[PDB]
Write a protein that binds this ligand. Structure first.
Ligand SMILES: [Ca+2]
Ligand SMILES: [Ca+2]
Ligand SMILES: [Ca+2]
Lengths: 202, 84
């Protein structure tokens, strides 16, 4: 089970189609051949940014996964661990959020790099079946008190355009849906990656 | 001022944390302070009379808490770490 928790990106500007920096986030799409190959496996799920080398400082976005997956916490209890894209970012924090996590970063200049921002260890249940798709969602959220971020150190006009791109075009959502066949079959085209098991029907 | 809101836009978020960290890195290398008056006061969230990466870490952690369980005010969160 997953739900579509993402919200409509509604700050000014909301059209990032002319952003100098067009950050794209890719999420692991792990596919197992058989239920027996998948059952009880822990998969490292990477959240990997491209096109924003040296262009960002301040990030914060939501991750959710199918409720049937079991997260394997870090030694500190965190559900996500920072990756190489964040190695030059002095501030990095993951807060747990049920079947999900909130991941945030900060830097004293535009030290954000391309590559793996975060990883999440997700374990496939013992009763996994051929055909199962466990979707993994990156989502924008906002409320009047605060919202998700992908901006530069000064939070410049270009950083706000880059943020608009990141949330509207850089990640999948109900307004930018996946066409990946696994997510279509999962009825989760708002999601971004997955752990799947092949159905292997003629 | 609102504690934690160093850009005074009514929101405590990662931009506040990055701003405190940026000020700390500038001062550390000997540049002049840019945080004065109520900005300086807003940055010192643990009330230890200095602005450093512990303040920036606290703002970011509040931003992440408010983004998840959201079960404590910013003022109560920063008071947990202030001197009795
Ligand atoms: Ca999504
Ligand atoms: Ca603020
Ligand atoms: Ca302080």
């Amino acid at each position: 089970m997953l739900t579509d928790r993402g919200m409509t990106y509604d700050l000014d500007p909301k059209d990032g189609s002319s952003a100098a920096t067009k950050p794209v986030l890719e999420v692991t799409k792990k596919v197992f051949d058989t239920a027996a190959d998948a059952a009880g496996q822990t998969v490292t799920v990477e959240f990997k940014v491209s096109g924003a080398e040296g262009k960002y400082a301040t990030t914060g976005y939501h991750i959710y996964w199918d409720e049937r997956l079991e997260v394997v916490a870090t030694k500190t209890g965190a559900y996500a661990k920072k990756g190489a894209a964040l190695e030059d970012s002095s501030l990095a924090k993951a807060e747990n959020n049920g079947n999900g996590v909130f991941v945030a970063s900060g830097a004293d200049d535009d030290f954000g790099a391309d590559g793996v921002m975060w990883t999440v260890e997700l374990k496939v249940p013992a009763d996994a079946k051929a055909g199962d798709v466990y979707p993994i969602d990156v989502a924008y959220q906002w409320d009047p008190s605060k919202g998700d971020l992908f901006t530069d150190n000064k939070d410049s006009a270009q950083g706000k355009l880059m943020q608009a791109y990141f949330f509207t075009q850089g990640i999948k959502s109900s307004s930018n849906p996946s066409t990946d066949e696994y997510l279509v079959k999962a009825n989760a085209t708002y999601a971004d990656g997955y752990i799947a098991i092949k159905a292997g029907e003629p | 001022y609102r504690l934690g809101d160093v850009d005074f836009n009514g929101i405590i978020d990662g931009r506040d944390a990055t701003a405190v960290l940026t000020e700390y890195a500038r001062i550390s290398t000997g540049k002049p302070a840019e945080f004065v008056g109520n900005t300086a006061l807003a940055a010192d969230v643990n009330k230890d009379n200095m602005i450093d990466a512990a303040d920036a870490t606290h703002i970011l952690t509040y931003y992440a808490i408010s983004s998840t369980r959201d079960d404590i005010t910013s003022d109560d969160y920063f008071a947990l770490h202030q001197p009795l």
